[PDB]
């Protein structure tokens, strides 16, 4: 926390997304709502989000950290679905920014104990790897389209292990 | 000559030490007077607060 | 915003070379860092008006306190506050109302600090 | 602390111990070389001092100009080498000034300058650095003597303080007097020496100054290398004791963490 | 349990800060010297 | 009530003889502490809510008596007896304006006299040894102590 994940991802949106022909998607998963509003207004100012015409180049999905775990565990899938559609039917390049994709895991962990599952190594659900794989495996560049996925991943207490 | 001229220049403003002393004495008397005022005020309000608390 | 920025840079540089205690440049860098450090101390339940904080930090960061010892900086801070709060209430009101250190305000601040430093 | 704090501390101390062992080995090699080079310089310097102790020269008791030279190095981590020398220098300078003299100081090595830069900061005639990087040569002593003579502080009496190397584990701090030709000319023991005007004697004094400085350099470097070897050995030993204690603590903490996580899992499993 | 390179400054204990300062002071000195030389070269190359 | 004459301090510190700085610094500090105290005290003693208060007490007569006694009774005020140092001011006028001024001005007068005397002298290429003897009494060769030629101690 406090190292530059959000600033770096905003910088990437500033560079790549602004000068990118294809569409773009931003799924804010379990992050501060202040930042969601700041991004909305910064995008409106830059022009990627146009409130007047139909020339907007970014679709936003928000599941911020005031939501109950059920919504945080699924907003990533909602943003991923929007990106998947733009990949397949539109048959075009897509960007997909997620911030953070650790809140998906964490939100999955906040309900596992109440669903009757014994916990795993460190208070995590037994299905951590499978639950994360069944999501990260739809964010891919198939032969029908191409998703460039940038993910911010919180590392609790700087512990990379 | 210039040394003497500078000494004379300082003669003019010699009086500031007395000026400081006067300011100090006057404002010290003023401080004591204000302390007396506030002390009577505080004691009387505590005095009467006794009765209301009772 | 004007003053705390330079103060932030000065403390950031000071914290790097602090673990020890030669040349004039780095010796003065440590001196300024220490002066600012003892400037930031404070008591309990005595918060300061923003303009007063600006005055103190401006005095400290503009090389004025670099002459004083670092054990006397608290004495300065306190006496300077007491002096300004009465003699120069007008300048503090100006800084609060206009919300910036204008050129005339800066020149005043300069002369007040220069006079007070010697007179102490 | 927590397990990560202990792990980081343990790794740091292990690195420190490795480094101190390597430095002890390097210092030991340099010490062996320094002793080897010190034997001949020992005979040479003792010979150069021969005259004054054979023709007993008493310094005049009516002169105020004195010179203090203190030989050390730039390198640290040598224990109480620079400390002893600086302590004795300030002792002697205080005594001289209490006797009403006009003392100066030459510092051969930074650490001497630093130790004496708070007090005696104004008596520094000149100081020399870059000592200790390579073994001292006669070139260094010639340069020091040349810059002492060139800098026109004609002194009336002198002293040099260096750490005489006794043994691989011990050293002593000495004070070898230095005389100016004013004292050699007017010494009755010197009336026996033949073919001696006041010019050959001046060249002789300049050479003897170079000789004594070189002797002190060799003794000081030998003692300093010995002290650095000893200091590094002791530091490595202390790091080893600290590593043992921290390894015990780390093992306790690792087991405690395993037990804590396992009990959390068990409680969660049984609390369904 | 092993040790790795660059661990003294990873712990951040006393030795870490001591090393950081021992580096920073030296390189501030060298930067000052190099800046002086750069100014001298600037002046000497105007003509 | 309060209007304190302003001071210059760097100016003030120029007028303390070394034998008198030990009292000057103490006076400065005492001024500092007293000024801080005065700043501490408020501009006025706060008011009193007699109506509400006497409405919140049973023996309203007793509180009324206290209120009236408060109104009638006032507080004293010190005097300038401790300001006897008034006298000192006049004494200073003597040194500053009568004594020191006068002898200083006379010494000036003499220094001028000497200066214009030393500035109006013939070019040295036209002067004579008697002239040096008179302009500079330092070039005189005292015959009272060196009657014989050269009247100098030749070792010179």
Swiss-Prot record, chain A:
Protein name: ATP synthase F(1) complex catalytic subunit beta, mitochondrial
Location(s), subcellular: Mitochondrion inner membrane
Sorted UniProt keywords: Acetylation, ATP synthesis, ATP-binding, CF(1), Glycoprotein, Hydrogen ion transport, Ion transport, Magnesium, Membrane, Metal-binding, Mitochondrion, Mitochondrion inner membrane, Nucleotide-binding, Phosphoprotein, Transit peptide, Translocase, Transport
Biological role: Catalytic subunit beta, of the mitochondrial membrane ATP synthase complex (F(1)F(0) ATP synthase or Complex V) that produces ATP from ADP in the presence of a proton gradient across the membrane which is generated by electron transport complexes of the respiratory chain. ATP synthase complex consist of a soluble F(1) head domain - the catalytic core - and a membrane F(1) domain - the membrane proton channel. These two domains are linked by a central stalk rotating inside the F(1) region and a stationary peripheral stalk.
List of residues binding phosphate: 2-6
Keyword ATP-binding applies: yes
UniProt source species: Bos taurus
Family named by the database record: Belongs to the ATPase alpha/beta chains family.
Modified sites of kind N6-acetyllysine: 52, 57
Main localization, broad class: mitochondrion
Residues holding ATP: 2, 4-7, 32
Curated annotation (Swiss-Prot), chain B:
N6-acetyllysine, modified sites: 5, 13
Protein name, as recorded: ATP synthase peripheral stalk subunit b, mitochondrial
Complete-protein stretch covered: 150 to 203 of 256
Location within or outside the cell: Mitochondrion; Mitochondrion inner membrane
Summary of the function given for this chain in its UniProt record: Subunit b, of the mitochondrial membrane ATP synthase complex (F(1)F(0) ATP synthase or Complex V) that produces ATP from ADP in the presence of a proton gradient across the membrane which is generated by electron transport complexes of the respiratory chain. ATP synthase complex consist of a soluble F(1) head domain - the catalytic core - and a membrane F(1) domain - the membrane proton channel. These two domains are linked by a central stalk rotating inside the F(1) region and a stationary peripheral stalk.
Annotated family: Belongs to the eukaryotic ATPase B chain family.
Coiled-coil region list: none
Transmembrane segments: none
Taxonomic superkingdom: Eukaryota
Swiss-Prot record, chain C:
Residues noted as binding ATP in the record, renumbered to the chain: 42, 44
Keyword Protease on entry: no
Localization in the cell: Mitochondrion inner membrane; Cell membrane
Residues annotated with N6-succinyllysine modification: 1, 67, 75, 100, 108
GO biological process entries: proton motive force-driven ATP synthesis
Keyword Signal: no
GO cellular component terms given for this protein: mitochondrial inner membrane; mitochondrion; plasma membrane; proton-transporting ATP synthase complex
Tissues of expression: Heart muscle (at protein level). Heart and liver.
Domain of life: Eukaryota
Modifications made to the protein after synthesis: Acetylated on lysine residues. BLOC1S1 is required for acetylation.
Modified residues (N6-acetyllysine): 1, 8, 67, 75, 100, 108, 110
MF terms (GO), sorted A to Z: ADP binding; ATP binding; proton-transporting ATP synthase activity, rotational mechanism
Keywords assigned by UniProt, alphabetized: Acetylation, ATP synthesis, ATP-binding, Cell membrane, CF(1), Glycoprotein, Hydrogen ion transport, Ion transport, Magnesium, Membrane, Metal-binding, Methylation, Mitochondrion, Mitochondrion inner membrane, Nucleotide-binding, Phosphoprotein, Pyrrolidone carboxylic acid, Transit peptide, Transport
Similarity-based family: Belongs to the ATPase alpha/beta chains family.
Subunit architecture: Homotrimer. Component of the ATP synthase complex composed at least of ATP5F1A/subunit alpha, ATP5F1B/subunit beta, ATP5MC1/subunit c (homooctomer), MT-ATP6/subunit a, MT-ATP8/subunit 8, ATP5ME/subunit e, ATP5MF/subunit f, ATP5MG/subunit g, ATP5MK/subunit k, ATP5MJ/subunit j, ATP5F1C/subunit gamma, ATP5F1D/subunit delta, ATP5F1E/subunit epsilon, ATP5PF/subunit F6, ATP5PB/subunit b, ATP5PD/subunit d, ATP5PO/subunit OSCP.
Organism: Bos taurus (Bovine)
Swiss-Prot record, chain E:
Effect of residue 34 to A: Impairs F(1)F(o)-ATP synthase-binding
Effect caused by changing residue 20 to A: Impairs F(1)F(o)-ATP synthase-binding
Domains as described in the record: Forms an alpha-helical dimer with monomers associated via an antiparallel alpha-helical coiled coil composed of residues 74-106, leaving each N-terminal inhibitory region (residues 26-62) accessible for interaction with an F1 catalytic domain. The inhibitory N-terminal region (residues 26-62) binds the alpha(ADP-bound)-beta(ADP-bound) (ATP5F1A-ATP5F1B) interface of F1-ATPase, and also contact the central gamma subunit (ATP5F1C).
Phenotype when changing residue 42 to K: Retains its inhibitory activity at pH 8.2 and does not form a homotetramer at high pH
Site (Participates in pH sensing): 19, 42
BP GO annotations: erythrocyte differentiation; heme biosynthetic process; negative regulation of endothelial cell proliferation; negative regulation of hydrolase activity; negative regulation of mitochondrial ATP synthesis coupled proton transport; protein homotetramerization
Protein name: ATPase inhibitor, mitochondrial
Subunit structure: Homodimer; represents the active form and is present at a pH value below 6.5. Homotetramer; represents the inactive form and is present at a pH value above 7.0.
Keyword Coiled coil set for record: yes
Species per Swiss-Prot/TrEMBL record: Bos taurus
Keyword Ligase: no
Record GO cellular component, one term: cell surface
GO molecular function: angiostatin binding; ATPase binding; ATPase inhibitor activity; calmodulin binding; identical protein binding; protein homodimerization activity; structural molecule activity
